[PDB]
Amino acid sequence: MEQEKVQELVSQMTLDEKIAQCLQLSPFLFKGTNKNAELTGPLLQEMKLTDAHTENAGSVLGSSSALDMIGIQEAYLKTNRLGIPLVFMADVIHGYKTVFPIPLALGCSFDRETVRVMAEVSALEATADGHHVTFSPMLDLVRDPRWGRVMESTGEDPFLNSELGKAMVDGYQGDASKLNENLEQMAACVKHFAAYGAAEAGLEYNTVNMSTRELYQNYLPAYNAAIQAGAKLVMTAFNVVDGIPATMNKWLNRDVLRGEMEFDGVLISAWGAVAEVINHGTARNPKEAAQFSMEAGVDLEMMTTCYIHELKGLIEEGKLSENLLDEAVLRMLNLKNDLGLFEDPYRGLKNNDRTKDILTDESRGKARAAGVESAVLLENKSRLLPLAKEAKIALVGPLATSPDILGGWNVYGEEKDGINVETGLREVFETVEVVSTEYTELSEEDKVAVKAAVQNMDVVVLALGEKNEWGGEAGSLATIRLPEAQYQLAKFVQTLGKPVVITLFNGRPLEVKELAESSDALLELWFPGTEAGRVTADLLSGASNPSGKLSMSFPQTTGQIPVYYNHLRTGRPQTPENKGERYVSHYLDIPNEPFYPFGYGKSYSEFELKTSSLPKELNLGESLHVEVTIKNISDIAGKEVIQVYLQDVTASISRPVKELKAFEKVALQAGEEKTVTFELTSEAFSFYNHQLEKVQEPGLHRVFVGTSSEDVDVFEVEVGGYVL
Amino acid sequence: MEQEKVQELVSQMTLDEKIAQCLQLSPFLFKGTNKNAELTGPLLQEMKLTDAHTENAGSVLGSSSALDMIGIQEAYLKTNRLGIPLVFMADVIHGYKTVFPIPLALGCSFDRETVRVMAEVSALEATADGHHVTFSPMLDLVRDPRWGRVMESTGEDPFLNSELGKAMVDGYQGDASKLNENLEQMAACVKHFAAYGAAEAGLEYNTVNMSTRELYQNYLPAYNAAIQAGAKLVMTAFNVVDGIPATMNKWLNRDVLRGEMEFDGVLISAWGAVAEVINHGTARNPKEAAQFSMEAGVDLEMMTTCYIHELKGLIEEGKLSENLLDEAVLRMLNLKNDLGLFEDPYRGLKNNDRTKDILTDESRGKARAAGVESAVLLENKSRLLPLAKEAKIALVGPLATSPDILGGWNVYGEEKDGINVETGLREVFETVEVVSTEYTELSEEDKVAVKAAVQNMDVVVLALGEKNEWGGEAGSLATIRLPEAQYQLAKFVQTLGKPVVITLFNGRPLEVKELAESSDALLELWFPGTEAGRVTADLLSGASNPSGKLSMSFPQTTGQIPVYYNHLRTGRPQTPENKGERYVSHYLDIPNEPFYPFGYGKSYSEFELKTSSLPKELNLGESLHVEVTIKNISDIAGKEVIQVYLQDVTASISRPVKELKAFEKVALQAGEEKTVTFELTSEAFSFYNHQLEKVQEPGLHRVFVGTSSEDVDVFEVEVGGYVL
Ligand SMILES: OC[C@H]1O[C@@H](O[C@H]2[C@H](O)[C@@H](O)[C@H](O)O[C@@H]2CO)[C@H](O)[C@@H](O)[C@@H]1O
Ligand SMILES: OC[C@H]1O[C@@H](O)[C@H](O)[C@@H](O)[C@@H]1O
Ligand SMILES: OC[C@H]1O[C@@H](O)[C@H](O)[C@@H](O)[C@@H]1O
Ligand SMILES: OC[C@H]1O[C@@H](O)[C@H](O)[C@@H](O)[C@@H]1O
Ligand SMILES: OC[C@H]1O[C@@H](O)[C@H](O)[C@@H](O)[C@@H]1O
Ligand SMILES: [Mg+2]
Ligand SMILES: [Mg+2]
């Protein structure tokens, strides 16, 4: 409907109606739910909610099905005075019912189209089950794998994170201006504004502190890129940002988000984060938390009651302008309008059961493709991999038969529909002998059974891994290791004198040095999702050729954290010309290098890259154009990730030794050759100075072209002269 | 001499003389050195230094003896045109020849007078060997025991560090206006400005980042306190501060240090730090490093040549004002004048050999007293300790006989003057059997020998520890554990049936859970210094009663780092009520609490504290006066450390759960009772706000009185009304 009618609605609502529009509730607090109706009464009472509240609530959080949605919406519109439909929001993080790989695995794909397709299928299915908004992409930069939520990020690089972030937004939303017509797309919500991934000591919800310059330089850019590509909502972070909880941080949300980034959509709290500013000790009570959060421009309170119970009194007493509430209500209403909810409140479902669009075989193939794009081949000594189809496999360990391969933040996907490792392998390999072990134990009886199975077979597939519940939200591990029983199992298996492949399933970087030394090959599958065992079978047999690269550094040990590729030089860098010396930046007990670096991954093919002659000089404001020829010099069809890095050698701020500024994944048949070009615009040469200006300074830059952050050729370009 | 004559001198110097005055060199680059003369000609060449340079250099670093000094000063004054004497500077960190405990141990004393005495004795001896300046106190706040330089800090609390920092300046300098008269006192140099202790991942020289507010709130206060108490010099830090190397950070050094803090003394670079701005990538070359470091107000270049080779040309070319040079030279000259070098360049030594004053028996008793004040008794189950003097001791471990007990940053003390644990013990206990083992091994032969000795005796003194070389500068450990062989050794000894005391020697917090659990008692000696063996024997026999408290948290494990008492609450604090719940700030694998907390330590006595009745309310600006009656309710004389903490319950910045604001160590005979009174000024109630103002806000505070950060009574005060 036309904008004047939306504004008219704000004009016609009562103050109590306006307040309640700023509240989000679980489905079972609404009349007409068709699930968990036993939780409805006790919880209404603890929250002190009444019908006057629920019958005017703005939004639903986490409906269970299309019928829950229809029931709740139909009943709500029977009783709602002005006919304002509810908006339905959910966590579709790496898939709906067809579960794709966890986001950290998707980072390892270095492939933008993989990420868009995952988001498109996610929306196809989520809208088919009645959802209007997804709380995705999660764009928190991560340098600390203790933190369980690393699995929701694309990793340690702001540029990769920005690019894949835009790809998710595009896949979820398509053309943002036609969400009222394209009802298989949905609104995306960028989360968590801001810098939540820097949680101190990897502890959930813990303190974050960094300088404003670093916040601009590294932590904000991906939120910004997704916002600029049209993301419809943003969600606040649980953490403090320079001492003030993000949720009531007026500088952050008013000046930066709404001012500098020009975000004019719904800002929704993280769960309870409005109330939690009290725990943080920056509001005395719910009246203060209400007041400050609305001043900061939080439009929608997720599952707490500060707004419903306190805004009236604040507005009446004059502590808070009613104008701030009207503008919140206007953003809520515009979102609903943008989704077409005033013409069709059932968003395509009322006369059209789209059950047929859920968990299709086409979708399952897309998920499998994504899994084979995302896996990272870490070791492969002796061309152990790929295995011949008639290889006799002893499949052993906790991930041999475990159905827990769908990953964390899988709110709607079902283990029964997933493919485990044994099942996947038996579709490909005629001879498999299996010994399941538990995640945290290694008994004598296990060792006897493993030993018998390995004696019978030719090669061991050792399937190790985390339970998903050891990561995700509030899954912080102080020591980023697997249970010790699993390292003991790898130690045991090695003694049996057969070639060993370790297939590792997990949601964070781990300490894998002992796994690498104990095996001939090591394949990092992360959690691939619904098609996990096929992903595994195809990569091990060579039907698919591994092509993923690490999007997060794998530490030598927990105590090396944080370690990351885009680090500062220091005043005393370790060099090959001084290694051995005492008075340089090093540790007495480990290398400075991570065990495996950013951008690293192996292949069954072999590539050779050649970069075209580059200029020696460049004007300010000018783009560098980088042309690269890649050839597959082996007999095996394969994909490689060409990566381009920049360094600013001398600047007014000590700048990182490398930053990624371009990537493309190139597919090549045996012997095929291709040329690709990259434009590094002058923004690729720019940075935030100590004054917080985005600047370009004349001087020397190095340009690194290669297939990891370590396997690069290097070139020099002197930037100077005039601008443009 | 008079100020006019100092100024006159600046006038009379040539440019080349002014430039060289800003250079500091090792003694063997000067004519007249009586040690390492073979190093002179080659290094003069590598540094491209001439006579015109060395004959006008401003300062000497690390002279080796009184005779090195005299010889160098005689020869230098022979050729120096205007007669400007050299100033001699040295690292007297925790003792000269009489070595005291390491600073982190002196932190655990909680005893201002212990710290002043150490510094007084340090100056007495250092001046006797011809030194004018010491590079102490080191006031870097530390939260990361991976960093080897934690040993040089007094720990994790800015208030303790501030207070103890003032005590050290007072002991070194006494009356700062009378350094030309008091020739047994010496100039103090505060180091390292600023925030060096926040090195990321505990890696030496590494990146430091934090918000400016945090910098003001926690990282700056100790440097400021020492500067306000009259410290004569300041030394720059190796790290970046907000992306700019401290050494050339003009905001840091001109605006904060000289401006806000009103420091008008010599600013000396850390070693090589002027040149190392090149490595950091904030200067292209030595000409830029020179200009930038001089713009920042660095007066004295430690052992690099940027100034010496580049200032002339920068000044002649108009890219640097000569007025900045003249400012630096005048500060150098004024420091010399403050030390009385213009009337007596040998600072009391020339006709007065003070050899007699070095390593006296009186000085040794003061170092032993500092040792018994500084040790911390961590465990003592079933009153194993004190031991009766007729107790039969099996003394075993790497620290049984090791002479390595003087600590890191012991530049002048000698192990041959030190008392080892065996020697110490044998002066007290008639029956000791000794089985030394190596630091990093445990052989079958060791175990047989250990088994025989423990069978013969009644109690085990298990002496465990670090080599001092595993810490100090560029001694970063990624995992804060002793070698595994030591933990094995503790496990083995526990099986032998006999009671075990572990005496631990070290320079950092370590993972000690496994030691606590394998022994009946645990005494943290750190590195007591020269008298270490007598320190250990007196505490174990109870001739001295343990009275130290932890000044730095002992983590549960490496991955808990950083953990510290003055932490923020977060939005989801783990409470006694919600423990076990998934969605709160916690780890899956360890407790939140460190293994031992700030302010914790045991005693052979038992104490009772009670706090006199406090006001419910306070005006803004008003001091809170806290009165505490402590009784010793045991038969054993001892000392308790009374600690007072404040918390700001609600604020415009999320504030820490506690901050230490007062402390006093009280000595009490059996049965004795005392009253101590504390004034918490309105400054104790103040903090830095998001706009970087020092403010006091109205509202609730909690006041905690007790004997650790955990063992406290709590009281509430509402601050409001008008301002005093
Ligand atoms: O230099 C950092 C480091 O200082 C060491 O001091 C040296 C000193 O520099 C040298 O001139 C003298 O001969 O010996 C000492 C070694 O005893 C100190 O020993 C280290 O602990 C500290 O980390
Ligand atoms: O479940 C809805 C939301 O709850 C928040 O608190 C979580 O941290 C988000 O990641 C999630 O999108
Ligand atoms: O109350 C804790 C709630 O917090 C949210 O952050 C979680 O994502 C929900 O699982 C949970 O119910
Ligand atoms: O509650 C927050 C959590 O959402 C759950 O429903 C998911 O299964 C978890 O993996 C995630 O960490
Ligand atoms: O690296 C050269 C010098 O650096 C200083 O910081 C160290 O303390 C010296 O021990 C060392 O010789
Ligand atoms: Mg540059
Ligand atoms: Mg307050």
DSSP string across A100-166 = ---HHHHHHHT-HHHHHHHHHHHHHHHHHTT--EE---B------TTSGGGGGS--S-HHHHHHHHH
Give me the residue from B211, B560, B592 closest to A211, CB to CB.
B211
Q: Which residues of A168-191 are buried (b: 16+ CB within 10 A; e: fewer)?
A: bbbbbbbebeebbebbbbbbbbbb
Neighbours of A474 (CB within 10 A): 20
Radius of gyration over alpha carbons of chain B, in Å? Answer: 27
Which of B207, B590, B654 is the closest to A478 by Cβ?
A: B590
Cα angle A218, A219, A221; round to 5? 75
The CATH code that applies to domain A1-359 is 3.20.20.300
Alpha carbon distance B516, B523 (integer Å): 10
- Residue B51 has which token pair? 């006579």
CB A70 within 8 A of CB A349: yes
Q: Is A16 on the interface with B (CB under 8 A)?
A: no
CB proximity under 8 Å: B 648-667 to A: 648-655
Distance from CA of A651 to the nearest CA of B (A): 5
> Angle at Cα B371 formed by Cα B369 and Cα B372, nearest 5°?
65
Q: Are A618 and A641 in contact (CB under 8 A)?
A: no
Mutate to test the interface with B, among A288, A570, A657, A690 (most CBs of B within 10 A): A570
Range A674-692 burial, b when 16+ CB lie within 10 A, else e: eeeebebebebbbbbbbee
CB-CB contact of A170 with A229 (8 Å): yes
Cβ < 6 A, ligand 4 pocket: A 408-411, 468, 472-473
Mind telling me how many Å the CA of B695 is from chain A's nearest CA?
15
SS3 of A484, please? helix
Cα–Cα distance measured from residue B408 to residue B100, given in angstroms and rounded to the nearest whole number: 11
- The architecture in CATH of the region A607-724 reads Sandwich (2.60)
Backbone region of residue A230 per phi and psi (left: phi > 0; alpha: psi in -120 to 50; beta: other values): left
Residue nearest to atom 8 of ligand 4 (CA): A409
3-state secondary structure of A717: strand
A264 touches chain B (CB under 8 A): no
What are the Cα distances from residue B155, in Å, to B104, B194, B222, B519, B565? 6, 15, 11, 27, 11
Spatial contact of A322 and A315, defined as CB atoms under 8 Å apart: yes
Parallel, antiparallel, or unpaired for β A638-648 and A699-706? antiparallel
Those residues whose C-beta lies under 8 Å from the C-beta of residue B183, and which sit 6 or more positions away, are B127, B340, B344, B347, B348
Please give, rounded to a whole number of angstroms, the shortest distance from the CA of A654 to a CA of chain B. Answer: 5
Interface size A-B, in CB pairs within 8 Å, comes to 239
SS3 of residue A347 by DSSP: coil
Provide the 3-class DSSP secondary structure of residue A573.
Answer: coil
Tell me whether A200 touches chain B (CB under 8 Å). yes
- Terminal Cα-to-Cα distance of chain B (whole angstroms): 45
CB contact set of A495 (below 8 Å; sequence gap of 6+):
none
Tokens of A356: 């047929």
Maximum Cα–Cα distance across chain B: 81
What's the CA gap between B505 and B400, in Å, rounded? 11
Per-residue exposure over B506-520, b if at least 16 CB sit within 10 Å of its own CB, e if not:
bbbbbbbebbbebbb
Q: How far is the CA of B269 from the centre of ligand 6 (A)?
A: 25
Residue A51 CB neighbour total at 10 angstroms? 10
Rounded distance, CA A287 to CA A307, Å? 8
- Give the alpha-carbon dihedral of B256, B260, B265, B268, to 10 degrees: -10
Which ligand sits closest to the CA of A585? 5
Residue burial B263-298, b: 16+ Cβ < 10 Å; e: rest = bebbbbbbbbbbbbbbbbbbbeebbbbbbbbbebbb
Q: How far is A504 from chain B (nearest CA, A)?
A: 21
User: Inter-chain contact B559–A282, Cβ cutoff 8 Å?
Assistant: no
Q: For residue B392, count CB atoms less than 10 angstroms from its CB and return exposed for 0-12, middle for 13-18, buried for 19 or more.
A: middle
Cβ contact, residue pair B201, A559, below 8 Å: yes
Q: Say if B593 is an interface residue toward chain A (CB within 8 Å).
A: no
What are the start-end ranges of the E strands in A398-491?
A: 431-436, 459-465
B46 Cβ neighbours under 8 A, 6+ residues apart: none
Nearest to A147 by CA among A568, A567, A552: A552
A238 touches chain B (CB under 8 A): yes
Nearest C-alpha neighbor of B213 from the set B196, B195, B232: B195
Residue of A nearest to B687 (CA): A243
Cβ pair B568, A280 in contact under 8 A? yes
Going by alpha carbons, the residue nearest to atom 4 of ligand 2 is A271
Across the beta sheet with B673-680, the strand order is B607-611, B624-632, B673-680
Nearest CB neighbour to B281, from listed A214, A477, A649: A649
To which H or E segment does residue B110 belong?
A: none
How many residues make up chain B in this entry?
724
> Which among A13, A94, A99 is positioned nearest to A56, based on CA atoms?
A13
Contact residues for A216 (Cβ-Cβ < 8 A; gap 6+): A688, A692
Contact state of A649 with B209 under an 8 Å Cβ cutoff: no
**Given in angstroms, what resolution was this structure solved at?**
2.0
Ligand closest to B698 (CA) is 7
Ligand in nearest proximity to the CA of A646: 6
DSSP-derived secondary structure letter, A300: B
Task: Give residue limits of the domains in chain B.
Answer: 1-359, 360-606, 607-724
Say which residue the tokens 């890191």 belong to.
Answer: B408
Which residues of chain B make contact with A478, given a CB cutoff of 8 A?
556-557, 559-560, 587, 589-590
Q: How far apart are CA B291 and CA B285, in angstroms?
A: 10
CA distance A506 to B1: 73
Residues in chain A: 724
CB B435 within 8 A of CB B446: yes
Residue A356: exposure state from Cβ atoms within 10 A (0-12, 13-18, ≥19): exposed
CATH superfamily of this structure's domain B360-606: Glycoside hydrolase family 3 C-terminal domain (3.40.50.1700)
The β-bridge partners of B587 are A476
Residue positions forming the annotated binding site of A:
648, 650
Determination technique for this entry: X-ray
Compute, in degrees rounded to 10, the torsion defined by CA atoms B176, B180, B186, B192: 60
Residue B609 has phi, psi (to 5 degrees) of: -120, 145
The helix/strand count (H/E) of chain B reads as 21, 26
Burial of A78 (0-12, 13-18, 19+ CB in 10 A): exposed
Q: Angle at CA A457, nearest 5°, toward A452 and A463? A: 80
Strand partners for B393: B432, B459
- Among protein residues, the one with the nearest Cα to ligand 2's atom 9 is A270
Cβ–Cβ gap B568/A280 under 8 Å: yes
Q: Residue A213: its chain B contacts at CB < 8 A?
A: 242-243
**Is the CB of residue B116 less than 8 Å from the CB of residue B171?**
yes
- Which residues pair with residue A720 across a beta bridge? A619
Quickly count: other Cβ atoms within 10 Å of residue A314's Cβ.
21
Q: Cα–chain-centroid distance for residue B228? A: 18
Give Rg (Cα) of chain A. 27
CA B709 to chain centre: 21
Compute the distance between CA of residue A205 and CA of residue A661 in angstroms, rounded to an integer: 31
Backbone angles phi, psi at A134, to 5 degrees: -110, 140
C-alpha–C-alpha distance, residues A639 and A624, integer Å: 25
Does the CB of B576 have a partner CB in chain A at under 8 Å?
no
User: What do you get for the CA distance between the two ends of chain A, in Å?
Assistant: 44
Cβ partners under 8 Å of residue A372, min gap 6: A535, A538, A539, A544, A546, A547
Closest chain B residue to A482, measured at CA: B589
Atom of ligand 3 nearest to the CA of B583: 2
The answer to whether the Cβ–Cβ distance between A282 and B650 falls below 8 Å is yes
Measured in whole angstroms, the distance separating CA A111 from the mean position of its chain's CA atoms is 14
Q: Chain B residue closest to A561 (CA)?
A: B201
Tokens at B701, concatenated: 């505070």
Exposed/middle/buried for residue B665 (C-beta within 10 Å: 0-12, 13-18, 19+): buried
State the DSSP H helix or E strand holding residue B323, giving kind and residue range, or none if neither. helix B322-338
User: Which residues have a Cβ under 8 Å from the Cβ of A70 and sit 6 or more positions away?
Assistant: A130, A346, A349, A350
Name the phi and psi angles at A300, rounded to 5. -145, 115
**Which residue shows structure tokens 């090695």?**
A494
- Rounded Cα distance between A16 and A84, Å, is 14
Bridge partners (DSSP) of residue A138 are: A191
For residue A367 the two structure tokens come to 């998920």
B271 lines ligand 5 (CB under 6 A): yes
B650 to chain A: closest CA residue: A281
Task: Answer whether A203 touches B (CB < 8 Å).
Answer: yes
> Could you tell me which of B167, B175, B190 has the C-alpha nearest to residue B338?
B175
What span, in angstroms and rounded, lies between the C-alpha atoms of B561 and B578?
Answer: 24
Asked if B289 is an interface residue toward chain A (Cβ–Cβ < 8 A), one would say no
Cβ B320 vs Cβ B314: under 8 Å:
yes
Q: Report the C-alpha gap between A181 and A347 in whole angstroms.
A: 9
Whether chain B has a CB inside 8 Å of the CB on A545: the answer is: no
Q: Enter the DSSP assignment of A349.
A: -
Q: How far is the CA of B615 from the centre of ligand 7 (A)?
A: 17
Token couple for B263 = 């420091």
CA B226, B232, B238, B243 torsion-angle sign: positive
What are the phi and psi torsion angles at A151 (to 5°)? -65, -20
Structural contact between residues B304 and B260, judged by C-beta atoms closer than 8 angstroms: no
B379: left (phi over 0), alpha (psi -120 to 50) or beta: beta
A582 vs B: CB within 8 A = yes
User: Which B residues in the span 141-180 are in contact with A, Cβ-Cβ below 8 Å?
Assistant: 146
Contacts of B56 (CB under 8 A, 6+ apart): B16, B17, B20, B21, B80
Q: Of the candidates A46, A91, A56, A106, which has an alpha carbon nearest to the alpha carbon of residue A76?
A: A56
Q: Which amino acid is at B207?
A: T
Region of A428 (left: φ > 0; alpha: ψ -120 to 50; beta: rest) is alpha
Q: What is the DSSP string of B190-213?
A: EEEETTGGG-GGG-TT------HH
Beta carbons of B690 and A207 less than 8 Å apart: no
**Helical H segments across A182-272, by residue range:** 212-214, 221-228, 250
Residue A473 beta carbon below 6 angstroms from any ligand 3 atom: yes
Q: What is the dihedral of CA A434, A438, A439, A440, to 10 degrees?
A: -140
Contact criterion met (CB below 8 Å) for B134 and B96? no
Q: Which residues 6+ apart lie within 8 Å of B686 measured at CB?
A: B694, B695, B696
